[PDB]
């Protein structure tokens, strides 16, 4: 399900697609010069920024997840260690 909405999202879409919450992608222009959508591609890559919460906003998921994960492998790094150190 998640790799269809996935599909869904990137591809199904017309003339603007806001594939991450800040950056829209404009469909092909009239004049069709590709050395010239190649350089507005690739310039719309250069004014983007990675955001900080990028893993929670560009990958459609919520970010109490996110902070789950980071809780869930705090748990595994700890849980070993308290086992490492009860053991000696």
Not at 35 to 58: F, G, K, Q, V
Not at 70 to 86: D, F, G, I
């Amino acid at each position: 399900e998640v790799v269809a909405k996935l599909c869904a999202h990137v591809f199904c879409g017309s003339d603007n697609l806001q594939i991450v919450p800040g950056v829209r992608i404009p469909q092909p222009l009239l004049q069709q010069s590709e050395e010239e959508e190649r350089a507005r591609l690739t310039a719309i890559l250069s004014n983007t920024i990675e955001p900080a919460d990028s893993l929670s906003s560009w990958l459609q998921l919520p970010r109490e997840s996110i902070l789950d994960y980071e809780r869930l492998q705090a748990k595994e790094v700890a849980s070993s260690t308290e086992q490492l150190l009860q053991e000696m």
